[PDB]
Amino acid sequence: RFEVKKWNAVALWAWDIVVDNCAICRNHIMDLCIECQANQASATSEECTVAWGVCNHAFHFHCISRWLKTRQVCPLDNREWEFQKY
Amino acid sequence: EEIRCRKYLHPSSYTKVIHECQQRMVADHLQFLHAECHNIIRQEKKNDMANMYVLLRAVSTGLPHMIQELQNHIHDEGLRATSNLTQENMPTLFVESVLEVHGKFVQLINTVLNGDQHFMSALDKALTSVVNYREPKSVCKAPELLAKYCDNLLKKSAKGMTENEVEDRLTSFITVFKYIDDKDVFQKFYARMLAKRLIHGLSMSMDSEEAMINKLKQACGYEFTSKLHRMYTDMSVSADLNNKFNNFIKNQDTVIDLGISFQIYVLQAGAWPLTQAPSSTFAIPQELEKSVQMFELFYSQHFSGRKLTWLHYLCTGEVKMNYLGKPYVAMVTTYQMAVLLAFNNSETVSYKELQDSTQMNEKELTKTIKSLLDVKMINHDSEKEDIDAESSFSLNMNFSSKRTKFKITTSMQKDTPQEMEQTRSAVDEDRKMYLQAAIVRIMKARKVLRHNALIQEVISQSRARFNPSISMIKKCIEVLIDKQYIERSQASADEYSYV
Amino acid sequence: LLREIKNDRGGEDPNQKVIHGVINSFVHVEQYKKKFPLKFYQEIFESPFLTETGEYYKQEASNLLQESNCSQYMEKVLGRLKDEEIRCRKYLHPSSYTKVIHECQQRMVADHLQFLHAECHNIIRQEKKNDMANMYVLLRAVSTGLPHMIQELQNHIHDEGLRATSNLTQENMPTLFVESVLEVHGKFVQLINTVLNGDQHFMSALDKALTSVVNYREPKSVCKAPELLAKYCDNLLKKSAKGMTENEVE
Ligand SMILES: [Zn+2]
Ligand SMILES: [Zn+2]
Ligand SMILES: [Zn+2]
How near does any CA of chain A get to the CA of B452, in Å? Predict the structure, then answer.
């Protein structure tokens, strides 16, 4: 019997962003968010607005709201997050 | 004569009388002084050196020959003190010899030579030629020696040197490092060794590594140690990242019971010299999959927009040897961990079984099996001891050694010629890239150039990092020609034209 | 004649002297015409040839997208573009050198601008110095190919510059801010000197992006860049006991 404990693991993080893709959903910005992907029948597919910051980054409104609920920093660039468009 | 001119003549003619006296007593007999320069410098007569220096500074064209003689003497002394070195402690001996030569000659210049800037420049040139002791038909071994020196001081060891000893030894070492050309090789070698020290925990203290990185930044620039500081930052914030991951898994809506403790070391991909260029598809063992999926979910949540590549060869774990009555707990690599878990699946194993279970490449699997039989963790029940398609072994029941933890395989030192050749090849590729960048930039600035002028200005521009061999400039020019980014004149290859 | 040229595009080598002799015959006949001495050559051969290579490279471009991604598709197009310069040199009149190559670009790169620009984001962001080099020469020939790589490179610099000068240590903000933009400027002037031909179309995109990461105002705050750069000069122009020789300071 060989149980395993204390896995010291090393990984390389790299910037992987797709054009016109939500950085939290990892799907298209124009589609519904991963929170609105569930219960799609009840969702009206209108509340998922594409929010843009002063850094010209596109996110889903639900994703960026849940992000700002804990971290006030944009994920793609480590900057304080604003809103400019709807 | 100065006293007599002061007591007799006008104060406005003090310098003319002394100048005429020196131009008819010292400047006239210049050949005798330049002949005795060699003897005085080589046998190092302090008072005679000062007396010669004052007069040769007074004469318009007497100083430079003494400068050349001192430069040649320092070069000969450095060659005599840095080429007849041993092989057991070559980096430390090389650095200490260069420090001793530099210290004694700075003392000589500041004491019996008035600390002239020309002589300090000559000493710097002589020490630069000494440390760049290119053995014929070979490569310069100095950057590797300094990298090994840095690794030896900054690694935790049993020597007993405190933090202040590391600090002032590295502060002295910076003087040796400043004379070192081909700094790209040293940068890559120190990046590799710093990566090994940070990952494997061999660093004695993070403060010493930060201080050494800051010293190199002051000595060369922020662009020299940008990657090094990124590595240090990613290994310092890793504690906070692991704490955040633990807080995430302890605050999940559904309680998760993963039976492994983590010390995750997520690193930046663009800064560390590591790679996944080995094409081995290790996948994962069964027990690690749930928790690695949990960590990938956490990283997708708390650090969104980035994907992480798992360097399976640099990971490590602790397998409890609960088979033969718990002798100890073995510190292994995930390749060996997967092999041992495959043995835990069934007491009989095979090379085909390991191939279909761990999915590793044949070379890596053979290397791990060799390292396992070297530490006699396995018993090698098959007859042949070389590479085999049988690979039948359960376990060596005599492996009940006293130590509570064993490193059944080692990767800290290594320094195989393959990795050194790969590092030098990456150095050459970056050198070609920087050389062609310099070519395009300086011929955009000039727009009209010849061979010799372009070579000289490119050598001068590149001197902050390396001395560029003309064949490399020719190769990058040919690359730019083939990629139709440059078009030299069709009348002759000497003249050049923009685009 | 087109069949023995399409045979050359198929890999096999026909007789170069025979084909070039016949092609030159269509213009050597007209050598005694004062007005339009190439009208016969531009109607009998060149107009059918441009139509033939128009429907061949269009068929070739659609045949390359089936088994090649954008990284190696431009490697294959540059192979065809380089060969077509060689092929039309030894087969056609020198007056038709530009028309054949330009029409080849109108079927391999200009007809696939939607495909190349869609994959142009992944090329710039991952900094593939080989794929970005091949993408540049393809999009440079087309009139409207460049203004999407220029915008996509500016977006990358605006995002790389913003990441570099971000969460800087409060103790050494004036020094870290200047070296971070200089690192981004130094790195992204190298990629527009080797990968790109020092283009003022591209170097302005670097300038247009770096001026937006230096002047990045915090929300409900004022831009701190003029204050940081003022303290950077004051830090180094003071009496620096930590070395800082006058040659190194300059
Ligand atoms: Zn989303
Ligand atoms: Zn939604
Ligand atoms: Zn942002």
Answer: 43
